[PDB]
Design a protein around this ligand. Structure first.
Ligand code: HEM
Ligand code: CYN
Length: 127
């Protein structure tokens, strides 16, 4: 009932579950909607792309070829606190799809990226 492995099937289930939580989210939903659209197909094309990102990260295969940091830099600014929401929802989704062992491998990878995005996107300083 829970994946003890990482494959196209498990990642596709992860994308389904996570981006449905994101779409329904009070804080994240508008950001994503303003960026990709509201149609089911636009959301399917986004899940496909992020699915390819994760396959490249986790399986070493797929057609993801974009610049993830640049993309988030180019987004209209949003609060740093949203990274907490994103991670909470992602961990919930992983907990549905994967056993504890696999879940923790992928969460760790997401945490590392989120931490890198945050150090790059917010000074936390002043100027
Ligand atoms: C506050 C948290 C985050 C928000 C609000 C957010 C938002 C978005 C949005 C709106 C897009 C669509 C970009 C567009 O169509 O212009 C996007 C793309 C993407 N996101 Fe995020 N993101 C967040 C965190 C993350 C994290 C932590 C990761 C990785 C672990 C990630 C991975 C990606 C990737 C790979 C893309 C595709 C970029 C491309 O088109 O090449 N995001 N994100
Ligand atoms: C970005 N999800």
């Amino acid at each position: 009932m829970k994946f003890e492995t990482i494959n196209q099937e498990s990642i596709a289930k992860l994308m389904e579950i996570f981006y449905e939580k994101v779409r329904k989210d009070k804080d994240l939903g508008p950001i994503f909607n303003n960026a990709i659209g509201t149609s089911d197909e636009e959301w399917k094309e986004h899940k496909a792309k992020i699915g390819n990102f994760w396959a490249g990260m986790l399986l070493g295969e797929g057609d993801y070829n974009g610049q993830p940091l640049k993309k988030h830099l180019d987004l209209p600014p949003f609060p740093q606190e949203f990274f907490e929401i994103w991670l909470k929802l992602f961990e919930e989704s992983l907990n549905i799809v994967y056993n504890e062992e696999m879940k923790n491998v992928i969460l760790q990878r997401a945490q590392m990226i989120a931490s890198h995005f945050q150090n790059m996107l917010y000074k936390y300083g002043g100027h």
